[PDB]
Amino acid sequence: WGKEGHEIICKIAQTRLDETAAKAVKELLPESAEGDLSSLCLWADRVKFRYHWSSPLHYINTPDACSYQYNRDCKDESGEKGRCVAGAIYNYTTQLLSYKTAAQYNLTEALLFVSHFMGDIHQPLHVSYASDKGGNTIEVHWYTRKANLHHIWDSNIIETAEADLYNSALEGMVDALKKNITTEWADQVKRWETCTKTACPDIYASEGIQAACDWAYKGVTEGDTLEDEYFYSRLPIVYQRLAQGGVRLAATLNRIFG
């Protein structure tokens, strides 16, 4: 996701932390954050080159098919196993288990990475085809503007919804997502939070590629103009994935710090 998606996910998550997790997050955040996790949920994107080793950790590349397997797909351009967003989530959640224990890692970074990557693993086109670079090479128009399909999913759909209903800001969208988490999707939310291991990234990635095939890629050809029909039909999936991301980020931090 772009800025708006990560902010939404982290705002939802921080309000769903239990007391012990809320305290740990406040302690691990720098003073400059003023206690707001969402103010740093794009930090990972800014260190893609400062920490070049981190760039493959934002996504998963799959073959041209609608399936994800950790062993097959979680690896970077040198084939190094684990170097994908799922592997990163396992890494940084494990690191955070070390908070306040008697026993090398910067746990502020671990928090910022897990927060961002929990978001990215929910963007459908972050678990999609290597052959089109997760939709980055699929050039279309979003209404009147040229854009690639990946960018439409990272940013354009959310921003257009913001402008359509929420006066070009994310607060109204956040409150509507929270409303639905409580009153429309309560049953689902309980399932989203369930994880028998730290975290369950492979579950999230498998959902993501299914969404990529069913919703993101579906019906789209190079050069198409995506407009109201695509926007209105895909918006609910975006809402679902943002809500899942926020719910799962909170549930994961609650497990880690409890």
Ligand X SMILES: *[C@@H]1O[C@H](CO)[C@@H](O[C@@H]2O[C@H](CO)[C@@H](O[C@@H]3O[C@H](CO)[C@@H](O)[C@H](O[C@H]4O[C@H](CO)[C@@H](O)[C@H](O)[C@@H]4O)[C@@H]3O)[C@H](O)[C@H]2NC(C)=O)[C@H](O)[C@H]1NC(C)=O
Ligand Y SMILES: *[C@@H]1O[C@H](CO)[C@@H](O[C@@H]2O[C@H](CO)[C@@H](O)[C@H](O)[C@H]2NC(C)=O)[C@H](O)[C@H]1NC(C)=O
Among residue numbers 228 through 247, which ones bind ligand NAG (CB under 6 A)? 239
Backbone φ and ψ of 147, nearest 5°: -160, 155
State yes or no: residue 27 binds ligand NAG (CB under 6 A). Answer: no
Binder to ligand X among 41, 57, 118, 177 (CB under 6 A)? 57
Among 47, 107, 130, 176, binds ligand NAG (CB under 6 A): 176
Q: Which of 48/133 has CB closer to ligand Y? A: 48
Q: Which of 2, 36, 43, 213 binds ligand Y (CB under 6 A)?
A: 43
Q: Which stretch binds ligand X (CB under 6 A): 11-19, 81-89, 187-195, 203-211?
A: 81-89
Note whether 180 binds ligand NAG by CB under 6 A.
Answer: yes
Residue 256 interacts with ligand X (CB under 6 A): yes or no: no
Q: Which amino acid appears at position 124 of this protein?
A: P
Binding mask 150-169 for Zn ion (x = CB under 5 A): ----x---------------
| Smaller CB separation from ligand X, 12 or 88 | 88
Interacting residue with Zn ion among 11, 58, 83, 234 (CB under 5 A): 58
Beta-carbon-side half-sphere exposure of residue 229 (alpha carbons within 13 Å): 6
Piece of the chain touching ligand X by CB under 6 A; list 84-92, 163-171, 179-187, 233-241 = 84-92
1 binds, among ligand X, Zn ion, ligand Y, none (CB under 5 to 8 A by kind): Zn ion
Which partner in ligand NAG, Zn ion, ligand Y, none is near 43 (CB below 5 to 8 A by kind)?
ligand Y
Residue 59 beta carbon to Zn ion: minimum distance, rounded to whole angstroms:
7
3-state secondary structure the chain: CCHHHHHHHHHHHHHCCCHHHHHHHHHHCCHHHCCCHHHHCCHHHHCCCCCHHHHHHHCEEECCCCCCCHHHHCECCCCCECCCHHHHHHHHHHHHCCCCCCCCCCHHHHHHHHHHHHHHCCCHHHEEEHHHCCCCCCEEEECCEEEEHHHHHHHHHHHHHHHHHCCCCHHHHHHHHHHHHHHCCHHHHHHHHCCCCCCCHHHHHHHHHHHHHHHHCCCCCCCCEECHHHHHHHHHHHHHHHHHHHHHHHHHHHHHHC
106 counts as binding ligand Y under rule CB under 6 A? yes
What is d(CA 41, CA 10) in angstroms, rounded to the nearest whole number?
Answer: 7
Question: Contact residues for ligand NAG (CB under 6 A)?
Answer: 176-177, 180, 184, 239
Question: Contact residues for Zn ion (CB under 5 A)?
Answer: 1, 45, 58, 120, 154
